[PDB]
From a paper:
Our model heterodimeric ABC exporter, BmrCD, is presumed to be associated with drug efflux in the Gram-positive bacterium Bacillus subtilis. BmrCD is a heterodimer consisting of two protomers: BmrC and BmrD. Incorporated in giant unilamellar vesicles, BmrCD can transport ethidium bromide in vitro, a process powered by ATP and inhibited by orthovanadate. Finally, a distinct feature of BmrCD sequence is the presence of an extracellular domain (ECD) that caps the TMD.
Finally, while attempting to obtain an OF conformation in a WT background, we determined another OC structure in PC/PA bilayers (cryo-EM dataset 5). The OC in the WT and QQ backgrounds are almost identical (RMSD value of 0.6 Å over 1039 Cα atoms). Although we could not conclusively establish from the density, we presume that it likely had ADP and Vi at the consensus NBS, given a 10-min incubation at 37 °C. The cryo-EM maps of an IF conformation under these conditions was not amenable to high resolution structure primarily due to highly flexible NBDs. We propose that the OC structure captured here represents a return step from the OF state, since it is likely that the ATP at the consensus NBS is already hydrolyzed (Step 4). Because previous DEER analysis indicated that population of the OF conformation requires ATP hydrolysis, we expect that the return step in the WT background to have ADP molecule in the consensus NBS.
Author numbering:
A (entry chain D): 2 to 666
B (entry chain C): 3 to 576
Write the structure that this text describes.
Amino acid sequence: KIGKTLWRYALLYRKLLITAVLLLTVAVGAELTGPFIGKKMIDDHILGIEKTWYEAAEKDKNAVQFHGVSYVREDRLQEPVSKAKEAHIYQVGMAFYFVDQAVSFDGNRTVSDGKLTITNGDKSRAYAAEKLTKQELFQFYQPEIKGMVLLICLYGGLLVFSVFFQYGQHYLLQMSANRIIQKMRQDVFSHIQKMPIRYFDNLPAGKVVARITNDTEAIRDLYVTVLSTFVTSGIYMFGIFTALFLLDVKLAFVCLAIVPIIWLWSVIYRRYASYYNQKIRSINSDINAKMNESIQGMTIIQAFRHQKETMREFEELNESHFYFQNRMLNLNSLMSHNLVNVIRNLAFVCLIWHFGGASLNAAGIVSIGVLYAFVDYLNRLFQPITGIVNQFSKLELARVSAGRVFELLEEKNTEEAGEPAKERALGRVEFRDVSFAYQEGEEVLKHISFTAQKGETVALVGHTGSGKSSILNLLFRFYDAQKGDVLIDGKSIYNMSRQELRSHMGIVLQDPYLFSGTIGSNVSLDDERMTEEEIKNALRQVGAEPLLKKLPKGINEPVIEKGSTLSSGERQLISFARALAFDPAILILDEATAHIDTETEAVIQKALDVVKQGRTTFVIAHRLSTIRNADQILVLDKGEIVERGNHEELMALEGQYYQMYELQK
Amino acid sequence: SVLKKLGWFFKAYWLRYTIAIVLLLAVNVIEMFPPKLLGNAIDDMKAGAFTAEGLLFYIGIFFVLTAAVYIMSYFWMHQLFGGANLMEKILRTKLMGHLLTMSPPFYEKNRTGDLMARGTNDLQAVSLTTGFGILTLVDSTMFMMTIFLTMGFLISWKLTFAAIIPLPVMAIAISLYGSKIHERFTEAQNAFGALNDRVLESVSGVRVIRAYVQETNDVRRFNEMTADVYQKNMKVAFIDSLFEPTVKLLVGASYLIGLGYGAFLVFRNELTLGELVSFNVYLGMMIWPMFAIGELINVMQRGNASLDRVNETLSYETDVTDPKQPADLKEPGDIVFSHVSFTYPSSTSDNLQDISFTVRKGQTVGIAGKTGSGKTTIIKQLLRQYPPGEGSITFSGVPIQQIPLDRLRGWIGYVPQDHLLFSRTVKENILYGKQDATDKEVQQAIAEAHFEKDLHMLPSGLETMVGEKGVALSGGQKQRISIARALMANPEILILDDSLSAVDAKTEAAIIKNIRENRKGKTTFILTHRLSAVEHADLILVMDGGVIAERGTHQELLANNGWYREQYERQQLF
Ligand SMILES: CCCCCCCC/C=C/CCCCCCCC(=O)O[C@@H](COC(=O)CCCCCCCCCCCCCCC)COP(=O)([O-])OCC[N+](C)(C)C
Ligand SMILES: Nc1ncnc2c1ncn2[C@@H]1O[C@H](COP(=O)(O)OP(=O)(O)OP(=O)(O)O)[C@@H](O)[C@H]1O
Ligand SMILES: [Mg+2]
Ligand SMILES: [Mg+2]
């Protein structure tokens, strides 16, 4: 399952993520204690003036000195005093009136002509007032300046705590995400390494590269952005809701009832996004494969003037990719951060509804600080939901990509790989009624049977489709024979390990392949068991290339794929040296000299091959001269060995070999 | 910087974006209301002036505003996302139209995986920045400015000011962070191309990597590459972890300044507790998005680097093999080389030296020589794959340069030495030289290249799906198809270039007979290592190094006692 596999990959790094979430919690603690400080400041400093007054300030925080006497209101007057029930200030419009008289009741603040006007409909002993305004005497809030400055400095201090912990959590999250991606990519490459050749044979090369690189990059984006934002948003929401429940429970309940809303939006987005994104990723893999094929074969795309028809084919994937992308506009325009604002304007409506309903009963004004804190927390709560929804889009895309990737790491047709080789083995090789058929009934080989005897050279010369390369494919276990046996030193190669079997044999494959590096790095394939065997094993058949070269062989660099800057015949001498460089017990030559002039080939290669004749060889040859002295020549016709024997016994027979030999001279 | 490189796109679809900007401005303006409405409602609540009628007014206003903003915001979201999709499409079309018309000299500097990246990945990044990046940038800028003006005019100009002075330093921090992030995204994007062509190299050469047991060294190299990439990304993560906390700290400093100074101001009798809430909602809506505007740079600069890569690919002047030449010849006629001294771009020594051979209107030319001797270096002069050298190649009397590349490639029928087939059917591959043949004409080409018999062996018979790079057929079945590919038409010049290297000494004789009968009067360029394939040639050139040593007909080169005679005796005795 995609979710279970992603979770297990996360569990591979369970300390970094736990530490990151703990650090982020420590940061969010201060980030959200801020507004609680604001509420405390508002409810005790700016609405403290409403308290009672009229003590002589015997001690504590001195007093306000309104007219000629000391005034302290509540907080620093809490020491045992005679507070009485007088000297209450009130606010009406922009005018602050000090009644300075025993106040009976309250509820409706109105002084008009210095009276008490109405008090919840009671009208209890209208009282004389006294206007103050702004500059008359505003030492009334003097005791609160110290508290405000202390709260400001407290939050300023908490900001640095937050900065340190935010750095820590961000760094840990990024490191964990990158480590997870590293592990996933390594696993993908290992699995591709243990894949049958059939998989690589009927699949475009660009499709495998697309799968691995592109889908792992999409999963990387997932882990490094989507999941990091998910964790941060979840912790922030967790903290904000915990704070909200500490202010009002019913309003907090209705505001928290939006989590089911987010779940439902996630489901509705996920359906359509999954379908359209699976289509989009399939089309993108097709695009990558087409790009690879076009670039690889560009030489004869232009020669045969296939550019317009090649542009037509590519534009049909580009147009289809665009079309399936434009089906995202409806979803991504109706379910983007847009809707979050609609929730923002609808969550504030509940705030106003609740607080107004409480106010009509003279209960919603009990704590304006609570309202301030609840507005700040709503703003904070709606800050991260935008990131949540953006990551919701990215998450659907990456879910599709991960589903694509894990369809590769599950494949149960893989092949066990016992890497270790063993000591040198005698070149004895045998076939026993080996019938092999590509794709079921189509048989390419029928009852093949032959044997080498530890030093003999087996020619195996036939016609252009007989199946001479299929024998090599069976011998190298690229393909498993469907009938018969193949044995090396009397043990079935199917009781071996493919690496163990292939360690015995060195092959000059048809269609030579060079790697991007140096020439000496191709003769060696970057193997430490080399020393200076490069020049010695290239001195054979390569004694004119490393001389004209501006660099001395191991420094001059081929380029991508087969060395584009090498002649087709020079790329086959490097493959021949590579095969000889890896000293094999059995040497397979699959038309190793098809692109090499007959002088170089015949003289040099044969002269320096006969000397090392204490070694079994297989020489798939269309040049019958290079196999004239083969100790046993086999004639393959329609996937069947029809004639056997050395050159003399095959010419005396006057058969297919005789015909070909007489024709080639 | 990023926008200017992107200015071509915006002045091409200006209604789709000017209307989006107008709608964005309208939604911002009508979103400036709810905060002030809430402030007024709270102020009314405190003074006991809140009535059910006021409640109805407020809920109705909020419903109308939210509905309007949603309706008229869905439209500009739909414009910007569609514009991003269109940008991706046009960029992909431009890229894949530039990759064609590009000659080998370009392709020997740029790797296939690098180009696949500079397509898929870079275009995805550019599309992401164009839609999401511009969206967020413009929306945030308009929101910030409108909030600033609203707070200044409706609340206070001294409390709005001094609540933004943390932003100047924020601008410098963003500048530094974005400037360093550009330099760490050109390498991050480049390292993706290095991974694409690393996997592509281990997939194409899977047989060689497995034939010699090397699956563990390949995995080790891949692991080392991944470790290097991880270290680079962790340097980037360190920079981002330094950047994010300062963003958050400046946001918190601005919030604290606003809140504390407003609380102080209420005592100076310059603000009402209702106005506080309004101001501290305005500033909150301004600053809280900066928790993500810091991350916006990670999309902007990724898009900038990706577009830089795409623009390096696109601003690659077509190699000196540019047609840029009208001429009225219509018939290749004679082909004369006169002092050709071509030198390959990645070479330091002359690859050809004073080549001075002539080919008449109907003549088979054999080319023999040693390996790496220049046999196919002469052929690639008529293929216009590389810049011309320091001589003349006068098709008839007209230099090869003054001949459009379309007409010349129509003249030439080419059989590459290295097989190049596509993942199509056999008939589809054969129908590459004509593209509009009847099944009768495709059969004639098959018959000429001794492939009629092998069709019976194939399971499908012209519907066999040769497979990727043609690996579903023997090596000599791939070659004969290629011969058919060149024999489907009737090219004035047929270039073979070792077209019988995989054929069983009897298919070779039949194909040579068929080509001799087919090209009796037409011009052919046969390059071979078996000198029995150019016995009929009117002129044989023997190469060595870059210059040609021997020349003449077959009977003339056996009287020279040179390389040709020695080769012939080595090959005619066995
Ligand atoms: C999930 C991961 C992330 C989690 C993130 C963490 C979540 C965010 C955490 C935030 C922590 C906030 C800390 C508060 C500090 C500043 C305020 C202060 O001290 O003064 C307050 C003290 O108030 C009182 O004494 C009255 C009772 C109410 C207490 C409210 C704060 C403590 C909440 C319970 C703490 C325990 C619960 C802890 C959580 C379970 C308010 O003062 P006031 O209103 O002026 O009081 C007088 C008002 N009057 C005059 C009208 C009468
Ligand atoms: N693209 C290239 N860039 C640089 N040098 C090249 C390039 N292609 C070939 N060369 C070199 O130029 C010389 C001539 O090569 P060319 O391919 O013409 O020889 P050739 O006779 O066709 O080879 P062969 O007989 O092997 O088929 C050789 O040294 C070869 O390695
Ligand atoms: Mg073969
Ligand atoms: Mg050649």
